[PDB]
């Protein structure tokens, strides 16, 4: 219910990102404030906090540090992220500013060898989903099996290891989930494979599925609260109708230039749960 974003740096923002298309420096700053307003109105997050400015544009990815599964947190392993570890320190401050340290993922960070990324782990009603691919190992799945697992008539919690190809993007990017037994999936090979893998597991779930054209960034969170809303890029129009036909209210947001930068909804915000 706590969401963190970082404002971009105007002086050091590079044009012509790693796709061969130039970008407009002013347009990013223009769109960011409207994104902030939409995020703070869209009723999906309780609070939004504005992180300070930093030079590196790769620091605009507020996520990929620390994932919230329940009342406790999980820091990400330090593997190839050392070059920006310093700025990671700053982020934690803002978190601790209005929240506790939870478990500090001592169990996860110090798990011998670790390869985790925020987005491979997606929560679900009485379930956890881990996208076993080129980013997550089986040791992480075993650790989550040890930690977040309970089995009983009412203490029912499950973990699903989903197989994916090497070229597939992270799990939380394409196939997501929205409340009230609605499951959003891309209409590509990766999405179909993920849907089939989920269907082979726990047939009694009875999860309706809605398809979206590939290449669409969307943000949707389970949350302790129940809400019917989704954040969708203001591009492909057919996805909005496809998801609205199922009774879910869509909300459009503009991410053309930041898409050319290569920044997704999952890494644009940092969801957190704060309790007492």
């Amino acid at each position: 219910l706590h969401a963190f974003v970082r404002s971009p740096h105007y002086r050091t923002i590079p044009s012509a990102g790693p796709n061969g298309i130039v970008v407009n420096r002013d347009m990013l700053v223009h769109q960011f404030r409207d994104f902030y307003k939409t995020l703070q109105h869209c009723s999906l997050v309780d609070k939004v906090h504005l992180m300070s400015e930093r030079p590196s544009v790769e620091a605009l990815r507020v996520a990929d540090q620390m994932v919230s599964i329940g009342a406790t947190f999980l820091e990400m392993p330090l593997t190839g992220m050392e070059h920006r570890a310093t700025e990671f320190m700053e982020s934690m401050r803002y978190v601790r500013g209005a929240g506790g340290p939870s478990t500090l993922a001592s169990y996860l960070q110090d798990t011998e060898n670790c390869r985790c990324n925020s987005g491979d782990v997606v929560c679900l009603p009485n379930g956890i989903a881990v996208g076993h691919g080129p980013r997550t190992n089986a040791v992480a799945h075993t650790t989550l099996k040890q930690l977040f697992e309970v089995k009983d008539d009412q203490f029912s919690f499950d973990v699903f290891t989903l197989e994916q190809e090497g070229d597939a993007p992270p799990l939380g990017d394409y196939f997501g989930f929205a409340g009230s037994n609605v499951l959003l999936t891309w209409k590509d090979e990766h999405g179909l494979l993920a849907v089939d893998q989920y269907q082979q597991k726990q047939p009694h779930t009875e999860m309706n599925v809605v398809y979206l054209e590939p290449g669409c960034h969307f943000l949707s969170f389970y949350g302790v609260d129940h809400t019917i809303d989704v954040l969708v890029q203001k591009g492909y129009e057919r996805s909005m109708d496809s998801i609205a036909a199922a009774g879910l209210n869509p909300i459009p947001v503009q991410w053309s230039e930041m898409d050319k930068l290569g920044i997704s909804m999952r890494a644009a915000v940092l969801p957190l749960k704060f309790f007492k």
Binding site: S7, R33, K37, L50, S52, R93, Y94, A98
Partner: protein, 172 residues
């Protein structure tokens, strides 16, 4: 506070500024950091029409001047149109006038807003904003005229305590 003026929300920032205003310290680094943070937060609307008065009053009483901060506060107050009532508008004018060493084109716009807030205000804010406009140093013929026109109805409410300020502002 000096090393923590960066990691605060709006409410904490305004509460801390209000708390430190009354003491009388003049730590320059703390005030610079808090001014930056206020400027950063005011870029995207994050201040209700109750903390701008507190921030402006605290900075004005603290005797610290900055064109950028006061410009940002004025712009944010300008964005929240029709939300600020007269009871929440006069103190902002008083605080801005107390640091009257400023430039025009700012009181020019404040003159426009004062046009429609003259009806439902009593003699106290009348005299106070009249002294404030006098200290601004700009001749507002129409604003002074309408203030004179509306002031005579509430001549009975004059307690003779603040008659001195409204008399002295004319000499000013």
């Amino acid at each position: 506070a000096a090393r923590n003026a960066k990691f605060l929300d709006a409410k904490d920032v305004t509460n801390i500024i209000s708390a430190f205003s009354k003491t009388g310290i003049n730590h320059e680094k703390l005030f610079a950091f808090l001014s930056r943070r206020v400027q950063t937060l005011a870029r995207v609307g994050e201040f209700e029409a109750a903390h701008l008065v507190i921030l402006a009053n605290a900075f004005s009483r603290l005797r610290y001047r900055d064109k950028f901060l006061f410009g940002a506060i004025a712009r944010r107050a300008m964005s929240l149109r029709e939300r600020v009532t007269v009871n929440e508008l006069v103190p902002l004018i008083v605080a801005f006038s107390k640091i009257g060493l400023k430039d025009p084109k700012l009181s020019k716009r404040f003159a426009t807003k004062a046009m429609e807030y003259v009806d439902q205000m009593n003699a106290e804010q009348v005299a106070s904003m009249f002294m404030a406009f006098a200290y601004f140093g700009i001749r507002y013929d129409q604003l002074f005229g309408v203030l004179t026109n509306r002031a005579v109805e509430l001549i009975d409410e004059f307690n003779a305590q603040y008659i001195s300020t409204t008399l002295n502002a004319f000499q000013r």
